[PDB]
Amino acid sequence: AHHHHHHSNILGITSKKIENFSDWYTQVIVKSELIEYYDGCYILRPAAYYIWECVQAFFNKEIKKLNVENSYFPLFVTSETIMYSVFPKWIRSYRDLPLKLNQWNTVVRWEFPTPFIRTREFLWQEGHTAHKNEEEAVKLVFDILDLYRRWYEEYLAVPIIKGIKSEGEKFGGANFTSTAEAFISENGRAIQAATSHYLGTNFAKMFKIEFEDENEVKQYVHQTSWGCTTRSIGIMIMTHGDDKGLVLPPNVSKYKVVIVPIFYKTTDENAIHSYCKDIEKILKNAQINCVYDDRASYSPGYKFNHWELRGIPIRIEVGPKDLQNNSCVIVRRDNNEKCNVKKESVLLETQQMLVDIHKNLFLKAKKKLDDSIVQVTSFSEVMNALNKKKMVLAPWCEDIATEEEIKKETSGAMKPLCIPLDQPPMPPNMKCFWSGKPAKRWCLFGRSY
Amino acid sequence: ILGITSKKIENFSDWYTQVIVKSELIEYYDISGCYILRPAAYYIWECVQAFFNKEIKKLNVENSYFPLETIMYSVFPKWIRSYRDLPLKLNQWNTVVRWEFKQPEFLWQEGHTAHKNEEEAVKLVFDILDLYRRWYEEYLAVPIIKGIKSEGEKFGGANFTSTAEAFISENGRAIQAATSHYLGTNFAKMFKIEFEDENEVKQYVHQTSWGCTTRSIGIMIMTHGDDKGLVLPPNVSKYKVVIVPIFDENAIHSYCKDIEKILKNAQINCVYDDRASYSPGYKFNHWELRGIPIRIEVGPKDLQNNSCVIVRRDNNEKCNVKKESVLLETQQMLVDIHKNLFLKAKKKLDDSIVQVTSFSEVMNALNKKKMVLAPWCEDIATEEEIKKETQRLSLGAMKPLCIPLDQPPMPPNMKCFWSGKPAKRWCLFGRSY
Ligand SMILES: [Cl-]
Ligand SMILES: [Cl-]
Ligand SMILES: [Cl-]
């Protein structure tokens, strides 16, 4: 009957994030128990699906405050839902507006493949609304965009940049496409995090989606659509993961704490086991889910690595030194800092530490994001920035023809990510870094996914 | 308005189509019969999903997503090596996608578990089955009968299939409402799902599976719907109350808005139908069709007496209520509506079961749109014999629905109604969907 003292190198992460990012990622997603391959479609195991559940609960609650109703439309065409053609059957009068719908979807197809990120398999939501006028639709587009900011920032501890897509990168049926953009600094790649579209009257004209207004004048509806996918999980993994494995923001971890007993003598086993159970009770009585790993066949050291790999935010260790001192050792996953905590203070310190882990994960990620943006004047400064795994903020004329030319001259190509909502001042005579006719606004450009 | 034009008792299938479309539950895409679950239908699914998730989580079942039982079980040995890995408990909420220009219920739930022994597995099978009873009975106000399927009607891979059966008395047809299967070690042997037990002995896992679909919604509609349209148990209606003004014209609005705020402040969602271009009669029918549990009517006299009139959807009874008593009376009424819907459906279910001792009583019961509870020897070969004979006499077949968990006494000398060797247990038989 075998005792396992040492977690073998091969069962941990054998590639370093910075040195071999793609293999590092592959290893983390399987070894942390997020996903499992069947044969390259993958199963979302509970640790991944739990993250989706948490963001789904938050988003549902928030969209319901905006009177959005969930629904389910099963017919799709190549991916988009057959829906707008039905809207004339439901809308006659301003009293029928706004129409506000959302659905939670699941799709799998043959892969073409980085799980969560470049995949034909995902869970998502998409919302669709129709309003009596432009201002109400555009307000809603930006309200939803801020909810995406919160999904990322409050749940995944991922900072995003809000912006408007360039004409070449926006959805063809949209008047404008707003976006949340994320950036993975370790490989220099931007990735679109969520989208929120003002569709104007385009589909109303196609399907005769018209209503009688309050003045008895016929008008087109103004539409919106918006979506966010399990790509969000990938972004989170890539943002916080380290060389020991997965790191989970506490808000999307099922177990907040793992309790590990330390003892080598049978005379100590009962007191250790009992104290560990006291701590498990204290936390669970307080609605803090946790796991007490009391397996006899694995050493404490093995268990440390086992649960770090799984991304548990806090580990509490209990050894004989701790019984003697009425304490325990609390270890944070994010930065591996340890402290001794009195038994009576474990609840409060754990609560405070879960909040601080989230803050630290976010603030460190935001620093990396901010440090990844180089503001440039000229195309000659661009390649050095790209090669430093950066994206660039450049004054740009926003001429659609230039997007394919920028791509072509700089997969190694950089593309317009978004024109950020937050604009630095534009100096009086600033020229486009490409054109160079007068520059309109600053645009972010980068290599992408 | 065009309301419901066919009577439930007279043309059931036409009634049903009119109710599901007119009430805004579904919209058909086209003659394929593919359809949209509109918010009124999806809201029901949401409510039961919330309930079920909460309860299965108390049993440590975790949600997951396997792309679409062979993918699934072939992967289980990768996760199970010792007793420490058990029990494995998974659930999935599934959605179907139909691609328009590609070669080919839209929502359902399926769970799967694996356990160290028979006792633990079977206990979960029955715990889940009671959660399905509660899904039906607490949220949908639909009574069900728990039982075990016959050998001929169980899932072929199961050691036994437990079931919740419902009956629609207006058309005399039973319907399987949910199922929960003990799979034994059948698939474990097939996919080599073994573990090392506490004593270092290799054992097979004991598995269960269980599911329920949007058919549950259809069952609810068939059960409580009436000739005016949909009837919603309050727990699965987005709006609990509609407020309808009856023409003041300024004081009326203000008064209706006061009631709206009282209810909404107490977290009771409601709608104040203040549309100027429709009559109150129009509005009454509009909201009845849509299944809203309670209407509150406010007219001039009610202003004068500081009252209003509360009207129940289920029985159309009215009562006069003081303004300051509206919140409490509304809360009590929503409870009482659910209780009445359930009790009247339970009475119809009870009255649909004829207990028989011989085959010569069966066709009379079937032709009266009943089910029969009969003493049966349970021999699989009799199932098709009984199907054929009841079909023949109809000119339709009845089949075994379930062997109820709640068994009446079996006299020591009772014969099977068909065979009649010694009878074992009572079995429910009926026509089915
Ligand atoms: Cl297609
Ligand atoms: Cl937390
Ligand atoms: Cl079955």
Judge whether B348 lies within some domain: no
- How far is CA A18 from each of CA A14, A24, A201, A315, A447, rounded to the nearest angstrom? 12, 9, 47, 26, 17
Annotated binding site of A for ATP: 109-112, 118-122, 192-194, 229-231
Claim to verify: residue A131 and residue A237 sit in the same structural domain: yes
Provide the β-strand partners of residue A228: A125
Provide the β-strand partners of residue A163: A179, A420
Q: Residue A295 and residue A337: Cα distance in Å, rounded?
A: 25
Q: How many helices (H) and strands (E) does chain A have?
A: 11, 22
Considering only CB atoms, B71 lies closest to which of A38, A50, A71, namely A38
Asked if A378 contacts A395 with a C-beta cutoff of 8 angstroms, the reply is no
Asked if B165 contacts B147 with a C-beta cutoff of 8 angstroms, the reply is yes
Judge whether A1 lies within some domain: no
Claim to verify: residue A430 and residue A347 sit in the same structural domain: no
Torsion of CA A18, A20, A22, A24, to 10 degrees: -80
Largest CA distance in chain A: 87
Q: Residue A34 and residue A42: Cα distance in Å, rounded?
A: 10
Q: Residue B274 and residue B334: Cα distance in Å, rounded?
A: 23
Judge whether B343 lies within some domain: no
Asked if A396 contacts A439 with a C-beta cutoff of 8 angstroms, the reply is yes
Q: Quick check: helix, strand or coil at residue B13?
A: helix
Provide the edge-to-edge strand list for the sheet that holds A80-81. Answer: A80-81, A75-77, B98-99
Exposed/middle/buried for residue B314 (C-beta within 10 Å: 0-12, 13-18, 19+): buried
Asked if A252 contacts A155 with a C-beta cutoff of 8 angstroms, the reply is yes
Closest CA to B310 of B257, B226, B254, B242: B242
Q: Residue A200 and residue B82: Cα distance in Å, rounded?
A: 59
Which of A312, A347, A372 terminates a domain? The answer is A372
- Residues followed by a break in chain A, C–N over 2.5 Å? 39, 78, 112, 410
Claim to verify: residue A93 and residue A207 sit in the same structural domain: yes
Nearest chain B residue (CA) to A41: B67
* Chain centre to alpha carbon of residue A391: 19
Claim to verify: residue A268 and residue A242 sit in the same structural domain: no
Q: Residue A337 and residue A346: Cα distance in Å, rounded?
A: 16
Q: Which amino acid is at B126?
A: F
Q: Quick check: helix, strand or coil at residue B28?
A: strand
B411's CB contacts (< 8 A; 6+ apart) are none
Which of B282, B309, B335 terminates a domain? The answer is B335
Largest CA distance in chain B: 84
Other beta carbons within 10 Å of B373:
21
Judge whether B427 lies within some domain: yes
Claim to verify: residue B223 and residue B243 sit in the same structural domain: no
Closest CA to A356 of A332, A373, A383: A332
Judge whether B274 lies within some domain: yes
Closest CA to B210 of B69, B380, B83, B407: B69
* Strands, E assignment, B233-337: 241-245, 270-272, 294-298, 307-312, 318-322
Q: Quick check: helix, strand or coil at residue A320?
A: helix
Considering only CB atoms, A43 lies closest to which of B66, B97, B275, namely B66
Q: Residue B413 and residue B421: Cα distance in Å, rounded?
A: 10
- How far is CA A248 from each of CA A67, A361, A428, A446, B62, rounded to the nearest angstrom? 31, 9, 46, 27, 18
Residues of B in CB contact (< 8 Å) with A are: 27, 29, 34-39, 42-43, 45-46, 62-68, 71, 74-75, 78-79, 84, 90, 94-102, 106-107, 200, 238, 275
Ramachandran class of A393: left when φ > 0, alpha when ψ lies in -120 to 50, beta otherwise? beta
DSSP run (H or E) holding A84: none
For chain B, what is the domain count? 3
- How far is CA A153 from each of CA A149, A245, A254, A448, rounded to the nearest angstrom? 6, 21, 18, 21
CATH number at residue A436: 3.30.110.30
B215 is in an annotated binding site: yes
Asked if B217 contacts B175 with a C-beta cutoff of 8 angstroms, the reply is no
Claim to verify: residue B236 and residue B223 sit in the same structural domain: no
Resolution in A: 1.9
Determine, for residues B46 and A107 on separate chains, whether the beta-carbon distance falls below 8 Å: no
Asked if B45 contacts B26 with a C-beta cutoff of 8 angstroms, the reply is no
Claim to verify: residue A327 and residue A447 sit in the same structural domain: no
B430's CB contacts (< 8 A; 6+ apart) are B167, B172, B173, B174, B366, B370, B371, B372, B398, B399, B401
Claim to verify: residue A259 and residue A244 sit in the same structural domain: no
Determine, for residues B39 and A70 on separate chains, whether the beta-carbon distance falls below 8 Å: yes
Q: Residue B164 and residue B349: Cα distance in Å, rounded?
A: 13
Q: Residue A145 and residue A194: Cα distance in Å, rounded?
A: 8
Q: Residue B411 and residue B88: Cα distance in Å, rounded?
A: 43
Query: Tokens at residue A236, please?
Result: 């989170």
Provide the β-strand partners of residue B161: B181
Asked if B162 contacts B127 with a C-beta cutoff of 8 angstroms, the reply is no
Query: Tokens at residue A296, please?
Result: 């006899």
Q: How many helices (H) and strands (E) does chain B have?
A: 12, 21
Q: Quick check: helix, strand or coil at residue A169?
A: coil
Asked if A203 contacts A209 with a C-beta cutoff of 8 angstroms, the reply is yes
B162's CB contacts (< 8 A; 6+ apart) are B125, B126, B129, B146, B147, B148, B149, B179, B180, B181, B182, B405
Q: Residue B239 and residue B234: Cα distance in Å, rounded?
A: 8
CB pairs under 8 A between A and B: 98
Closest CA to B129 of B107, B145, B108, B106: B145
Task: Report chain A residues whose CB lies below 8 A from the CB of B66.
Answer: 43-44
Ligand nearest to the CA of A75: 1
Judge whether A8 lies within some domain: no
Judge whether B227 lies within some domain: yes
Asked if A77 contacts B99 with a C-beta cutoff of 8 angstroms, the reply is yes
Other beta carbons within 10 Å of B103:
4
Asked if A397 contacts A439 with a C-beta cutoff of 8 angstroms, the reply is yes
Closest CA to B336 of B236, B265, B260, B233: B233
C-alpha neighbours within 13 Å on the C-beta side of residue B344: 13
Ligand nearest to the CA of A109: 1
Torsion of CA A37, A41, A46, A49, to 10 degrees: 150
Query: Tokens at residue B412, please?
Result: 């020591």
Ligand nearest to the CA of A82: 1
CATH number at residue B100: 3.30.930.10
Other beta carbons within 10 Å of B119:
10
Exposed/middle/buried for residue B317 (C-beta within 10 Å: 0-12, 13-18, 19+): exposed
Q: Residue A363 and residue A359: Cα distance in Å, rounded?
A: 6
- Please report how the helices A346-371 and A266-285 are oriented relative to each other, as an axis angle in degrees rounded to 10: 70
Claim to verify: residue B307 and residue B237 sit in the same structural domain: yes
Which of A353, A372, A391 terminates a domain? The answer is A372
* Strands, E assignment, B214-269: 241-245
Pairing of strands B270-272, B241-245: parallel
Given CA atoms A72, A73, A77, A80 in this order, what sign does their dihedral have? negative
Q: Quick check: helix, strand or coil at residue A196?
A: strand
Asked if A441 contacts A420 with a C-beta cutoff of 8 angstroms, the reply is no
Instruction: Give the range of the structural domain holding residue A243, as residue numbers without chain letter.
Output: 14-249
Q: Residue B108 and residue A236: Cα distance in Å, rounded?
A: 29
Claim to verify: residue A114 and residue A213 sit in the same structural domain: yes
Closest CA to A163 of A408, A421, A355: A421
Claim to verify: residue A64 and residue A38 sit in the same structural domain: yes
Closest CA to B218 of B32, B97, B44: B44
Q: Residue A383 and residue B379: Cα distance in Å, rounded?
A: 80
Judge whether A9 lies within some domain: no
Asked if A305 contacts A258 with a C-beta cutoff of 8 angstroms, the reply is no
Closest CA to B57 of B47, B45, B49: B49
Claim to verify: residue A420 and residue A328 sit in the same structural domain: no
Give the DSSP letter of residue B408: P
Provide the β-strand partners of residue A99: A130
Please give, rounded to a whole number of angstroms, the shortest distance from the CA of A35 to a CA of chain B. 10
Q: Residue A343 and residue A13: Cα distance in Å, rounded?
A: 34
Ramachandran class of B357: left when φ > 0, alpha when ψ lies in -120 to 50, beta otherwise? alpha
Backbone angles phi, psi at B226, to 5 degrees: -135, -175
Other beta carbons within 10 Å of B101:
6
CATH number at residue B266: 3.40.50.800
Q: Residue B252 and residue A445: Cα distance in Å, rounded?
A: 59
Report the residue of A31, A71, A230 to disrupt the B interface, i.e. the one with the largest count of B CBs within 10 Å: A71
Asked if A262 contacts A317 with a C-beta cutoff of 8 angstroms, the reply is yes
Pairing of strands B206-213, A290-292: unpaired
